[PDB]
Amino acid sequence: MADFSLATASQRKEWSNKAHMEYVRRSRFAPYIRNTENSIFQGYSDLEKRAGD
Amino acid sequence: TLNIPLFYKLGGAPVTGDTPIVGNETPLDNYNCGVPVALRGKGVAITKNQTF
Amino acid sequence: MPATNSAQARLAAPGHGFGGNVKVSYGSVAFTGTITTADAATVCNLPVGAIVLGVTLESDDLDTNATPTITLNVGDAGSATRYFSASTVAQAGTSSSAPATTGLLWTVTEGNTAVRIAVANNAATSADGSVRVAVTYYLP
Amino acid sequence: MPATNSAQARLAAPGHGFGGNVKVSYGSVAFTGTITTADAATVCNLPVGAIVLGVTLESDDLDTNATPTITLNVGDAGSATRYFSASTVAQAGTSSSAPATTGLLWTVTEGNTAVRIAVANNAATSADGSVRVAVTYYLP
């Protein structure tokens, strides 16, 4: 063209602020981890109290 | 970085006698200059073995 | 060595808009009866400040003889033979559609703004037909 | 059989308005003094994105000899003989107004936007005159 002809290295760009993450697929063992006695994977909060190894 | 533009002057021949102002085109010249930017610094330490 | 740049030597340079994107003028004069050398007619009319690019002359068969002899001139009031001189495209044996070769790039003056067709040589046997002229030019 | 429709194969199609209703560029370079092969001058200048339609070259009588030998080249900075090669319309015996026959429908590149006239052969006896060039083209 021969109108106002802007340069190739003078053309603007733009960078976005919103970023994407990668999917993780949380857990398939999550409904089965409880602290009661009739659970498959049983937890113990006895060392969350006073002390121990 | 930071890019700065420039426009030149105008160049051709005055369209003598008969010629249009729609036939015979010009471009307008245009250029760029980009300045890159960097971090830099300096520091000084002071002990206590050399201070009392 | 003294061949400098033109009288044009400093400016920018034309494109899209209302300038002199080149133009036409078209006429279709109709000849009838007998055809002698006392014929003259305007087909089109031109500006004052304009330069011609090219003239196209297409006609029919006007002299249907075994030896055709009809002959046309295209010009204006100043020069009667300015664009075409002894055209012979109206003959029934040759071909039509001859482009102009003389006096192309020149500025029209005052009193020369009407294109005439004058008959140069008598027709041996006059037929009925028409002659078309298209003149291309532009303006500053 | 594999001759398909063109790279054009899908769209509508232009008319009245601001497009590339075809255009001109005209220059009148004036030669004077003695005429050697060290002559070069711009007559007009072209766009970047444009395709040429035709170049018309009309000149005066520049070499008034019994055997004329002046010879012109019309081109640009890339090819010195792109439009006309060995024109010989400036001779005082032959006719002027020769249309271009080589390199018509081609897109102008960058750095090729100025039409030069260079003298190819020396003039046997230099006269004073001028040379006119009209270049038709259009834009997308």
Report residue A37 as tokens: 């006695």
Q: Which residues contact D44 (CB under 8 A, 6 or more apart)?
A: B13, B19, B24, C8, C13, D25, D26, D27, D114, D115, D133, D135
Question: Residue C22: phi, psi to the nearest 5?
Answer: -65, 155
DSSP state of C48: S
* Secondary structure tally for chain C: helices H, strands E: 0, 7
Note whether D130 and D32 are within 8 A (CB).
Answer: no
CA nearest to D73, candidates D25, D120, D133, D140:
D120
Q: How far apart, in Å, are the Cα atoms of A7 and each of A11, C87, D56?
A: 7, 54, 34
Cβ pair C54:D56 closer than 8 A: yes
Residues D135/D82, Cβ–Cβ less than 8 Å: no
Of D22, D26, D33, the CB nearest to C2: D33
Distance CA B46, CA B52 (A): 11
The C-alpha atoms of residue A39 and residue A43 are separated, in whole angstroms, by 9
All residues at 6 or more sequence positions from D129 whose CB lies less than 8 Å from its CB, including other chains: D30, D31, D59, D60, D61, D62, D90
Q: Which is it for strands C40-44 and C115-121: parallel, antiparallel or unpaired? A: antiparallel
Q: Which residues of D touch A2 (CB under 8 A)?
A: 47-50, 139
> What's the rounded Cα separation, in Å, for the pair D23 and B19?
10
Beta bridge partners of C107: C51
Q: Is B16–C7 a contact, with Cβ atoms under 8 angstroms apart?
A: yes
C-alpha to C-alpha distance for D45 and D58, rounded to whole angstroms? 18
Chain A residues interacting with chain D (CB cutoff of 8 angstroms) = 1-2, 5
Q: Which two tokens stand for residue A28?
A: 């398939």
The Cα–Cα gap between C138 and D19 comes to 17
Question: DSSP code of A9?
Answer: T
Q: How far apart are CA C98 and CA C78, in angstroms?
A: 22
> How far lies B6's CA from each of B10, B28, B30, C76, C117, in Å?
13, 11, 6, 53, 58
Indicate the residue type of B29: D
What is the enclosing helix (H) or strand (E) of D119? strand D115-121
DSSP C32: -
In whole angstroms, what is the distance from residue D57 CA to residue C54 CA? 12
- d(CA D81, CA D118) in angstroms, rounded, equals 9
Whether the CB-CB separation of D33 and D126 falls below 8 Å is answered with yes
User: Please, are residues C133 and C115 in contact by the beta-carbon 8 Å criterion?
Assistant: yes
The CA-to-CA distance between both ends of chain B, in Å, stands at: 47
What's the CA gap between D63 and D71, in Å, rounded? Answer: 10
Query: C17 CB near a chain A CB, below 8 Å?
Result: no
Q: Is C15 on the interface with A (CB under 8 A)?
A: yes
- State the method: cryo-EM
3-state secondary structure of C40: strand
Count Cβ atoms below 10 Å from residue D106 Cβ, excluding itself: 11
The residue whose two tokens read 């029209």 is: C108
* Residue B43 in contact with partner chain D when CB distance is under 8 A: no
Q: Identify which of C15, C11, D24 has the alpha carbon closest to the alpha carbon of residue A1.
A: C15
